[PDB]
Amino acid sequence: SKIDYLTLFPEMFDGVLNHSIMKRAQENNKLQINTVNFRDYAINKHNQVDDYPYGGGQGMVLKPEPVFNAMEDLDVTEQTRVILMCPQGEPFSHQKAVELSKADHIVFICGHYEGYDERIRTHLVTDEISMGDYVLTGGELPAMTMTDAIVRLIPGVSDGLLEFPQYTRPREFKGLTVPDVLLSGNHANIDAWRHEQKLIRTYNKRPDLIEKYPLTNADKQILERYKIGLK
Ligand SMILES: NCc1ccc(CNC(=O)c2csc3nc[nH]c(=O)c23)cc1
């Protein structure tokens, strides 16, 4: 598996690529990563990478020329996945992280442009993906974030409830005391207490999850005595 980033700000990938999980995984001969710059493939390098839109338009538009040239020498194939970071792409998701982790070659087209030449989309891009309804400056951070979720899912690199509260040393800290049950060594009571907390927190902060949860008699009894202790 190999992952390529087509970007104008390749320096912006410095920390991410050289540090943490991707830095380790690259070294294990698990994936090859390349950071390629658009401007390098500009036909003229003076009116390059982008230009005015035919028929008028709000902003500048990424030109097809540099992009097809980049794909050409990146050895892109019909099995490759050419992902375009765009605001109106499909929101990224876990099922997509799996599908892409199962792919050999991935090419991210990262950009800030008000628009992308349609010929790029119709004949190169296999996938268009966003991070969500909000507005970002460009595609690099989304490309890196998607890479993170995909890479950890490459080999070799919920119960329907919110999680239970967790605590560690010290036991007492600014008057804030770890629940005693967690120090008692009674694993049945520790699990039961954790389960009660899961139920109560989900009740308070995600009641929709309680509705989708197969509540036992004990679970109902727990919620009632909680909503009665409240008064
Ligand atoms: N006015 C149109 C317009 C066009 C491009 C941009 C630059 N944005 C991106 O390249 C982007 C990539 S993935 C993603 N996910 C969520 N939001 C985003 O903005 C993005 C912003 C606004």
Residue numbers in the entry: 19 to 175, 188 to 261
Reported in the publication:
The tRNA m1G37 methyltransferase (TrmD) is considered essential in various bacteria, including Staphylococcus aureus, a pathogen responsible for a wide range of diseases. TrmD was identified as a potentially selective antimicrobial drug target, due to its essential role as well as the structural differences from Trm5. We have identified selective S. aureus TrmD inhibitors with inhibitory activity in the nanomolar to low micromolar range using a direct-to-biology assay read-out. To analyze the binding mode of the compounds identified in the nanoSAR study and to guide future inhibitor optimization, we cocrystallized S. aureus TrmD with inhibitor 2 and the new TrmD inhibitor 8h.
Hill et al. discovered the thienopyrimidone inhibitor 1 by screening a collection of fragments against H. influenzae TrmD, and their subsequent optimization resulted in inhibitor 2 with activities in the nanomolar to micromolar range. The cocrystal structure of 2 was solved at a resolution of 2.5 Å in the space group P4332, containing one protein molecule per asymmetric unit. The N- and C-terminal domains of the monomer were resolved, but the highly flexible linker connecting the domains could not be resolved, similar to many published TrmD structures. ,− For the cocrystallized complex, the N-terminal domain showed discrete electron density for inhibitor 2. Also, the conformation and ligand interactions of 2 were found to be similar for both H. influenzae and S. aureus enzymes. An ionic interaction was formed between the primary amine of 2 and Glu132 in S. aureus (Glu116 in H. influenzae), a residue highly conserved among TrmD orthologues. The thienopyrimidone ring system displayed interactions with S. aureus Met149 (H. influenzae Ile133), Tyr152 (Tyr136), Leu154 (Leu138), and Pro105 (Pro89), within the conserved SAM pocket. To analyze the differences in binding affinity of parent compound 2 between the H. influenzae and S. aureus enzymes, we used the HYDE scoring function in the SeeSAR toolkit to predict favorable and unfavorable contributions of individual ligand atoms to the overall binding energy. The computer-aided investigation revealed that the main difference stems from the amide group interactions, which contributed favorably to H. influenzae TrmD (HYDE: −3.8 kJ/mol), but unfavorably to the S. aureus enzyme (HYDE: +11.0 kJ/mol). Additionally, the terminal amine of inhibitor 2 contributed favorably (HYDE: −3.0 kJ/mol) for the H. influenzae enzyme, whereas it resulted in a slightly unfavorable interaction for the S. aureus enzyme (HYDE: +0.3 kJ/mol). Also, these two crystallographic findings rationalize the results gleaned from the nanoSAR optimization: the transformation of amide to triazole and the transformation of benzylamine to guanidine were beneficial for S. aureus TrmD affinity due to their protein–ligand interactions.
